[PDB]
Amino acid sequence: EKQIELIAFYVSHLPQELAISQYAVFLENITDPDQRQRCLELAKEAGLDVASITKTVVENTRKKDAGEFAHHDFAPALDSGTSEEDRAKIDVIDWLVFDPAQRAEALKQSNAIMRKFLASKKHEAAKEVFAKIPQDSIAEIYSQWEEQAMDSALPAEDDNAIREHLCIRAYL
Amino acid sequence: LVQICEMTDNQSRLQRYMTLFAEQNFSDFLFRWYLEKGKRGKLLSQPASQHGQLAAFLQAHLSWLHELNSQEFEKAHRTLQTLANMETRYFCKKKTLLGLSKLAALASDFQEDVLQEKVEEIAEQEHFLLHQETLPKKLLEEKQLDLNAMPVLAPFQLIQLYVCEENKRANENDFMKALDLLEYIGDDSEVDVEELKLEILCKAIKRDEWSATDGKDDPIEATKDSIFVKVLQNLLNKGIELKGYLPKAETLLQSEELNSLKTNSYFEFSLKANYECYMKM
Amino acid sequence: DVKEKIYNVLLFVDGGWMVDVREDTEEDPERSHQMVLLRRLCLPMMCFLLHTVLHNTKQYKDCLRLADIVSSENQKLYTVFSKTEMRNLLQKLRESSLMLLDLQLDPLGYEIQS
């Protein structure tokens, strides 16, 4: 019934897990960037874990496919085109790209999309994803890790994802 | 006659048409080619680039090519290795032929056992070559040597080049690797093993620089120190007789070489001093 | 420019193109499988494109240096080539070597010492 002003209160009288899952399904229908920002402000003024929610949305979208990693000897000539299901996996990364801090999740999710595009020889689509997190995305990942007061090297996942992105760049 | 007419022109379409309609003219044309060594069958006498490269196509008539036109990888590997062995003129080419030989064998249909033998005998060839490959870029500009358009090296040459005065920034690793290259010799009692064992441990002290600061000993032996810290790989827990396994180095025989360099007065204070905590180590 | 850019792929630093350097993470078997497939796909292709560029531009000596690069233990590029691709590479290298002989050079692109 689109009664937006009422939902947050009734959701607070329910378990967090339901608040995260329902607000996530609501935000999936929001395409307008100004409305996206306004919804995150309203969610913060209330109180859910935007960070665990947007991570869970991306993981759920990744887990919908039981597509096994089959070696070359048994996969037919797969359509090298971006399917509607591939499009949904590309567009789910936008959830983690809204917040500057979620930079670690933006990197993990963009790497996972770039892996699919590189396998499909869609080098221009992989460059567009790489550019999305900006020509500054690598510097931003390092800056955010330094700001968390960690005198340690980057997580092996994020360092390998940066390296994979630089490999794809050199190839494109 | 007809075979030398087909050879003065650019018509090896004719010598193909001659061998197409003949009884045994193949066994004749090859033996007629060999007798005519430098006389007929040359592609340098023919203007081989035109219709004379259409002549060159049949006068190019062979198993190396056999791989290109029949995929006999195993045969290509045998000839590629044979060419790599006779190669003496160009180091860069000897390296390339072995690479190609190895890629030909890896892409061939050898049984896993045969493939393992070929890649092991090859690993030896890569092992010797890797010595000339690792030649320091200080000495190759000092001796004014061409980078690729020149010849390779032996453990003697490598050991001697690692320790040259010219190797200015020579640290613990350069000397350690110049003592690792002693098991690669051949005829150890002929070529003097323990002479070189001294030559190196003595230039290992010349680079150290034994000095004095305010009337007190200056232990420059920081590299000699470090090299004797690097010989022991903790072989006590490896079950090796590490206890009593530094009598490789000499002592009284060392100060003989130190006298030749004129450096005995400087370093003989801490040479013995460090040789006491090397009998405790 | 093409030669430089293809060499940045073939000679990619620290263990080669699409290889993880940090093993202190959980193994994603789907990711590691896809990376091995992309190496078998992209690296032979890049070597053939570079051969084609160098051959068409008459840099036949640099075509033969691709054998040294493919056989290099630093990048282990020889492990990602199929037996058919390795045969096709050797055929293409032979074609460039024949063009050096037509230029009165040795099979490796050195001056024939008379």
Spatial neighbors of A171 by CB under 8 A, at least 6 apart, are: A118, A123, C9, C17, C42, C46
Sign of the dihedral defined by the CA atoms of residues B217, B220, B224, B227, in that order: positive
CA distance C65 to chain A (A): 20
A63 touches chain C (CB under 8 A): no
CA distance A25 to chain C (A): 28
Would you give the distance in Å from CA A155 to the centre of its chain? Answer: 18
| CA distances for B242 relative to B147, B233, B234, B249, B279, angstroms | 42, 9, 8, 14, 12
A·C CB contacts under 8 A:
46
| Largest Cα span, chain B | 101
Give the residues across from B217 on adjacent strands. B212
Which residue carries 């935007």 as its tokens? A50
CA distance B175 to B223: 9
CA atoms within 13 A on the CB side of A40: 15
Whether B107 and C93 lie within 8 Å, measured CB to CB: no
User: Is the pair A, B in contact (3+ CB pairs within 8 Å)?
Assistant: no
**Which residue of C lies nearest to B73 if distances are taken between CA atoms?**
C87
Residue A134: CB atoms within 10 Å: 10
Tokens of B146: 């061409």
Coil vs helix vs strand at C84: helix
Smallest Cβ distance to C94: which of B68, B99, B103?
B68
Q: Taking a contact as any Cβ pair under 8 Å apart, which residues of chain B between 64 and 83 contact chain C?
A: 67-68, 71, 73, 76
First-last CA distance in chain B: 87
| Whether B81 contacts B101, CB under 8 Å | yes
Coil vs helix vs strand at C4: helix
CA dihedral A122, A125, A126, A129 (to 10 degrees): -160
C34 touches chain A (CB under 8 A): yes
B122 touches chain C (CB under 8 A): no
Residues ending a continuous segment of chain B before a break (C–N > 2.5 Å):
61
CA distance A7 to A58: 23
Q: Tell me which H or E stretch contains C37.
A: helix C29-56
CA distance A32 to chain C (A): 33
A2 touches chain C (CB under 8 A): no
Tokens of B269: 């204070």
Spatial neighbors of C88 by CB under 8 A, at least 6 apart, are: C48
Tokens of B157: 């040459």
CA distance C33 to C28: 9
Mutate to test the interface with A, among C3, C37, C81 (most CBs of A within 10 A): C37
User: According to the entry, how was the structure determined?
Assistant: cryo-EM
Nearest to C9 by CA among A166, A158, A118, A110: A166
Nearest to C73 by CA among B200, B71, B69, B133: B133
Q: Is B95 exposed, middle or buried (0-12, 13-18, 19+ CB in 10 A)?
A: buried
CA distance C97 to C107: 5
Whether C12 and A170 lie within 8 Å, measured CB to CB: yes
Tokens of B130: 């890797």
Smallest Cβ distance to A160: which of C17, C20, C29?
C20
Coil vs helix vs strand at A84: helix
CA distance C38 to C80: 9
CA distance C14 to chain B (A): 18
Which residue carries 């990048």 as its tokens? C75
Spatial neighbors of B193 by CB under 8 A, at least 6 apart, are: B182, B185
CA distance C101 to A86: 52
Spatial neighbors of A92 by CB under 8 A, at least 6 apart, are: A57, A58, A61, A62, A109
Whether B103 and C73 lie within 8 Å, measured CB to CB: no
Instruction: For residue B273, report the phi and psi dihedrals to the nearest 5 degrees.
Output: -55, -45
Nearest to A59 by CA among A14, A17, A95: A95
Residues ending a continuous segment of chain A before a break (C–N > 2.5 Å):
none
| Whether C44 contacts C82, CB under 8 Å | yes
Spatial neighbors of B104 by CB under 8 A, at least 6 apart, are: B67, B73, B76, B77, B80, C86, C90
| Whether B213 contacts B270, CB under 8 Å | no
Coil vs helix vs strand at A106: helix
Coil vs helix vs strand at A77: coil
Per residue, the 3-state secondary structure of chain B, as one string, reads CHHHHHHHCCCHHHHHHHHHCCCCHHHHHHHHHHHCCCCCCCCCCCCCCCHHHHHHHHHCCCHHHHHHHHCCHHHHHHHHHHHHHHCCCCHHHHHHHHHHHHHHHHCCCCCHHHHHHHHHHHHHHHHHHHHHHCCCCCHHHHCCCCCCCCCCCCHHHHHHHHCCCCCCCCCHHHHHHHHHHHHHCCCCCCCCHHHHHHHHHHHHHHCCCCEEECCEEECCCHHHHHHHHHCCCCCCCCCCCCCCCCCCCCCHHHHHHHHHHCCHHHHHHHHHHHCCCCCCC
* Neighboring chain C residues of B104 at a CB cutoff of 8 Å: 86, 90
CA distance A17 to A46: 15
Resolution (A): 5.6
C29 touches chain A (CB under 8 A): yes
Instruction: Quote the DSSP letter at residue A151.
Output: -
Tokens of B195: 């002479």
* Neighboring chain C residues of B108 at a CB cutoff of 8 Å: 83
Q: Are strands B216-218 and B211-213 parallel, antiparallel or unpaired?
A: antiparallel
* Neighboring chain C residues of B106 at a CB cutoff of 8 Å: 78-79, 83, 86
**Which residue of C lies nearest to A164 if distances are taken between CA atoms?**
C18
| Whether B93 contacts B87, CB under 8 Å | yes
CA distance A116 to A80: 10
Spatial neighbors of A129 by CB under 8 A, at least 6 apart, are: A90, A93, A110, A113, A114, A117
Q: How many residues does the structure list for chain A?
A: 172
| CA distances for A47 relative to A11, A15, A23, A53, A98, angstroms | 11, 13, 11, 12, 17
Coil vs helix vs strand at C111: strand
* Neighboring chain A residues of C45 at a CB cutoff of 8 Å: none
Phi-psi region of C58 (alpha: psi -120 to 50; beta: other; left: phi over 0): left
DSSP codes, A110-133: HHHHHHHHHHTT-HHHHHHHHHHS
Which residue carries 């080049």 as its tokens? B161
Tokens of A14: 């329910």
* Neighboring chain C residues of B126 at a CB cutoff of 8 Å: 73
| Whether C90 contacts B100, CB under 8 Å | yes
First-last CA distance in chain C: 36
Tokens of B247: 């009598």
Beta strands in chain A (DSSP E): none
Smallest Cβ distance to B100: which of C67, C84, C85?
C67
